[model samples]
Target: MSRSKVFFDITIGGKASGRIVMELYDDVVPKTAGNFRALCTGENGIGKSGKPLHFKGSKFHRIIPNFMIQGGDFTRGNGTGGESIYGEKFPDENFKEKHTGPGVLSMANAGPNTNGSQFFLCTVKTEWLDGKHVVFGRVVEGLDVVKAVESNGSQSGKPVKDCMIADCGQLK
Candidate 1:
């Protein structure tokens, strides 16, 4: 069971928040796992989706306090305008990795088995969506960075300011 390490250096309202390093449970969710890793490295060139297949400089559109922060729509912004390495939507992997932790690396789908470039990091208490979302990764570092994000967040899910993935890549 080989696990891959990756990280995302986030920015909130144009200020550096910090880095979130996560462990991709490839053994349990290979496709879903590999998808994010490839996106972090993002060497696949511009995908069929018009936007660059990268997470860098992408906005985190949805934010909810005591809930989660969602982003990864490189093709568009905020939501609805991205694609997978395959089609506009990809298949959902597994629920072996539940959303019962401080942070989970999960995908945002339009519906069933419609995984796209969208994803989120939650702050505990959202196992409900795990039935629909695929938790391919989990945070292994950077909870401090979590504060600046949701701290400014409200219950409305609208971010106070623009939040984006300032940088991302494979750890090693």
Candidate 2:
């Protein structure tokens, strides 16, 4: 099946905050992709309060240059919290997608089948991460901004400058 592209506009904070556009794979990994899309829309899934969910005010809490930039922890500003459409967590989908290059987007989990709202975007080739994380998307635009976040992050992987996912949604 052909894959569908979905774009998200993420704004990074700094002296000059910029926007990053990402394309999610809606066909290659439907469950994970759909979970992400629902979060983006704030209309497709249940949340901690049994309400609709979204990624509107989430921050890229972790940024590691030459590795990945992680975010989508909408429930908590820190890296410790998030939720799935199931209201808590969900099982890992089939692992047909692989993380092989920069700009690749994948689910962030503590272990297998623990995917929630948290996800990360690769800023460099991370073949070792392939098949471990669920690869569900890539950056279709704003690669520079993604790299900037990676370069500017502190030793702890937290951005010295705030990098927020200001807005997100499905695209044609």
Candidate 3:
């Protein structure tokens, strides 16, 4: 299904904030695409809806500067093993679409069959990661939010302290 681009407001560190617009590639990354949409749409029917990933806790873990930030490892709390809850990792082919671009969204998996709740946002236009990961969403307004999160983020990169989903809403 062809989808449209949407804008999202992101606030990090309770004081820092930014906005980003992204196109949800429903045509590709279906499962992940669906999961991400559900989380944003709150269709989980569990009320967990409307909540950002509730990250609970995280660390920047990996930093490539003009590249991307990797964190999403619930088990190691520092992006070590993989899958905090445990699940089959979707195949790379699952990410039929390229890695969208800078300010794009993608999932962080343990390997080829271990994707859980971990995910990352792109900091630059990394075409090199084309088929390596799945691009689900993009940042349309909050490049600063991502920058702040990455810059002010703890030495590990997970927010200096702990960040909550805070809120999730549809684009106007």
Best by lDDT: 1
Question: How close is every model to the real structure, measured as TM-score?
Answer: 0.94, 0.88, 0.66
lDDT of 3 by residue, 19-130 (tens): 4455676776556665555445443442222223423333445645556766544345556543422142445436555665567788776457456556777877777766
- Give the TM-score ranking, best first: 1, 2, 3
Model 1 lDDT-worst window of ten:
78-87
lDDT of 1 by residue, 1-172 (tens): 5899999898888888899899999899888887788889887768886667888888878888888888888876858687777657878777777888777888888889889888888887687886888888888899778767878777888888887789999986
Go through the candidates in order and give each one's C-alpha lDDT.
0.83, 0.77, 0.54
Residue-pair clashes per candidate: 0, 0, 19
List ranges where model 1 is wrong by over 4 Å: none
The Cα error of candidate 2 at residue 61, in Å, is: 0.5
- Model 2: per-residue lDDT, tens digit, 1-172? 3454555565556344466666767767788888887887787555775544778767789888778989888777687888887677888886777877888889999888889889998877887877678888888887887887787677678787787777677665
At residue 48, give the lDDT of candidate 2.
71
